[PDB]
């Protein structure tokens, strides 16, 4: 199928409490594989998946060097933005950056991204063409002008279209056991008497990978969108995910209701019924 590699960076100023916080994480699909934390003891990029531990010191030294450079860049940017928005030195502010690439089911470059936010809102983003920029506001228009003049998009395009996808393909093969797998959901239903005339039917999906799943209820084959409680998909902690969907059913009508599960790991979509 299709795959992605994404890096996420969070920078938080700590006025009077020393250097800003900097945290970097890297994913392939829904699997984290690296981290850096400015506050941790090692001051190195660290592995968070077994398959990447096989890379040598040249890899780890290189990622450590680059992630430190990213950190310094975010340190300088926090100051620049504070000035752009005429903000005081007292307050904590947040910068976020995400970039990466998608390949399609043919493993070829499909899409690239590079986005930047200040205090929780869009600041500047690379457009889908990887040639121009979307500035969210007046201040950002300064950055847009600077970056256009310095041809910043051109070198970023080269990374997103080339090296990003080459490394993605390398990780997919090296981590084939972990990354080119699916874990199909393990499913079950629970039934809990609310009152003496209603019962909650809860449809569970557990231990699945990747995270994308569709869980829905029908009554006599009709969509129960507005009547379903659906929780956000959540991590189990072991690299799999969980989700549930519940409906309240008038006691005795349990037979009318069907739970429908769609997931890549399933040979065919599932229908569950309380019977």
């Amino acid at each position: 199928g299709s795959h992605s590699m994404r890096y996420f960076f969070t920078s938080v100023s700590r006025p009077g409490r020393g250097e800003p916080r900097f945290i970097a994480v890297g994913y392939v699909d829904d699997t984290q594989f690296v981290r850096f934390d400015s506050d941790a003891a090692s001051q190195r990029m660290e592995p968070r998946a077994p398959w990447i531990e096989q890379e040598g010191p040249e890899y780890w030294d290189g990622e450590t060097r680059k992630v430190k450079a990213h950190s310094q860049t975010h340190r300088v940017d926090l100051g620049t933005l504070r000035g752009y928005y005429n903000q005081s030195e007292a307050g904590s502010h947040t910068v976020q950056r995400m970039y990466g690439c998608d390949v399609g089911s043919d493993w070829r470059f499909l899409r690239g991204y590079h986005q930047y936010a200040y205090d929780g809102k869009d600041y500047i983003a690379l457009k889908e063409d990887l040639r121009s920029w979307t500035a969210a506001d007046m201040a950002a228009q300064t950055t847009k002008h600077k970056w256009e003049a310095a041809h910043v998009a051109e070198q970023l395009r080269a990374y997103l279209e080339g090296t990003c996808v080459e490394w993605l393909r390398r990780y997919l093969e090296n981590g084939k056991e972990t990354l080119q797998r699916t874990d199909a959901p393990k499913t079950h239903m629970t039934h809990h008497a609310v009152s003496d005339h209603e019962a909650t039917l809860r449809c569970w999906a557990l231990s699945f990978y990747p995270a994308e799943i569709t869980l829905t209820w029908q009554r006599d084959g009709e969509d129960q969108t507005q009547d379903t409680e659906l929780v956000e998909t959540r991590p189990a902690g072991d690299g799999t995910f969980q989700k549930w969907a519940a409906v309240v059913v008038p006691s005795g009508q349990e037979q009318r209701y069907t739970c429908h599960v769609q997931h890549e790991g399933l040979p065919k979509p599932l229908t569950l019924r309380w019977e």
């Binding site: 680059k66 990213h70 860049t73 940017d77 620049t80 950055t143 970056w147 990003c164």
Partner: peptide, 9 residues
């Protein structure tokens, strides 16, 4: 692998 040439704002 991280991008090597990140431009400042």
């Amino acid at each position: 692998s991280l991008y090597n040439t990140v431009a400042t704002l």
